[PDB]
Amino acid sequence: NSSLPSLRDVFANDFRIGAAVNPVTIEMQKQLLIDHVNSITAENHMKFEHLQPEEGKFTFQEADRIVDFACSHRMAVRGHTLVWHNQTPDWVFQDGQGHFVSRDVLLERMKCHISTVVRRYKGKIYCWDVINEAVADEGNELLRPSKWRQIIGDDFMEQAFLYAYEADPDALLFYNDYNECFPEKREKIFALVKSLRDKGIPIHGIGMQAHWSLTRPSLDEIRAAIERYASLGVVLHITELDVSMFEFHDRRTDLAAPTSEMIERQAERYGQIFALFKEYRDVIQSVTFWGIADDHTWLDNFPVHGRKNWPLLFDEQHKPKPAFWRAVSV
Ligand SMILES: O[C@@H]1[C@@H](O)[C@H](O[C@@H]2CO[C@@H](O)[C@H](O)[C@H]2O)OC[C@H]1O
Ligand code: NA
């Protein structure tokens, strides 16, 4: 690694390079982080359930540690995430009798959470994924069902962005989602963000999660999505990048290691993807991987629990994989 190029330096004039982490992985992958990234995202500790597990009970300890680490190494921090249909405690949507609260009550709770969380990190966190995955991933409906939407109404996103803006008007606010390059969903995301922007809502960027496979989405689909979203005038962040060795239909659990073909195709895939990102450097300002080395990845248990995946640029021994070389040589 002594003569290895540094990711953040290679892309210094293109975009920040980030990694998702937690207190445990910061320790385990500390040197890799210090040598390669200039942006950090909390993989789980800034989500609702990990910040306000019980009403009025805020547990900022883990998030504070992540922010302390980032700031001590001059790394930016992306806040993830405020309003999402997942990892949000049941108390949020219920009253004392266990019944769903009213629109006004949920809005009060949303505002309180957003205000308390955003104000705490104001000046340290430069952007926030305010709304996460509100768009439907299947069907003809624009929006996915969720208790937020059910109780408040479809304007729940407008409210979330306005509350976040009030808490920190200098932060860049994002709508973040996955399968962002499949045409049907891309158009829903485009339509949604355009509608918000057309109402003057403070949504500054779109976060493309990029939980991709070796084959999907195609390079043309990626290009088309970047251009489609960029046409809205918003900033673009690739937020949770990883390249799975398994396609959606591939639920095998026997592979103890990736084949030479999979490693090679992954190398080619990463080189093609980064070549495209660099081409669109004028609109893409940050590229964050959902981790940094294969010794830690949520893909080991999702969508198939108990297996192993090798989605990143460094292997389990924290050594550069073939994908690393193609990615940094674009
Ligand atoms: O540890 C796991 C996290 O890595 C996981 O993170 C989510 C991955 O899917 C994305 O669409 C989400 O934005 C991101 O937060 O969440 C589950 C947790 O168990
Ligand atoms: Na850029």
What CATH number did the domain enclosing 202 receive? 3.20.20.80
Is residue 161 lining ligand 1, measured as CB closer than 6 Å? Answer: no
Report yes or no: 290 and 266 within 8 Å, Cβ to Cβ: no
**Active-site choice (133, 138, 221, 316):** 133
d(CA 213, CA 250): 11
Ligand 1 pocket: which of 24, 132, 240 to mutate (most atoms <8 Å of CB)?
240
Our count of domains for the chain comes to 1
| 133 in catalytic set | yes
Range of the domain at 289: 1-330
Give resolution, Å, one decimal.
Answer: 1.6
Name the residue at shortest CA distance from atom 14 of ligand 1: 43
Which atom of ligand 1 is found nearest the CA of 178? 11
Using the mean position of ligand 2's atoms as its centre, give its distance from the Cα of residue 99 in Å.
47
CB of 85 closer than 6 A to ligand 1?
A: no
Closest ligand 1 atom, residue 177 Cα: 11
Tell the residue nearest (CA) to atom 6 of ligand 1. Answer: 43
- Name the experimental technique: X-ray
* Ligand nearest to the CA of residue 134, numbered in listed order: 1
Q: Is 240 a catalytic residue?
A: yes
Q: Please work out whether the CB of residue 240 comes within 6 Å of at least one atom of ligand 1.
A: yes
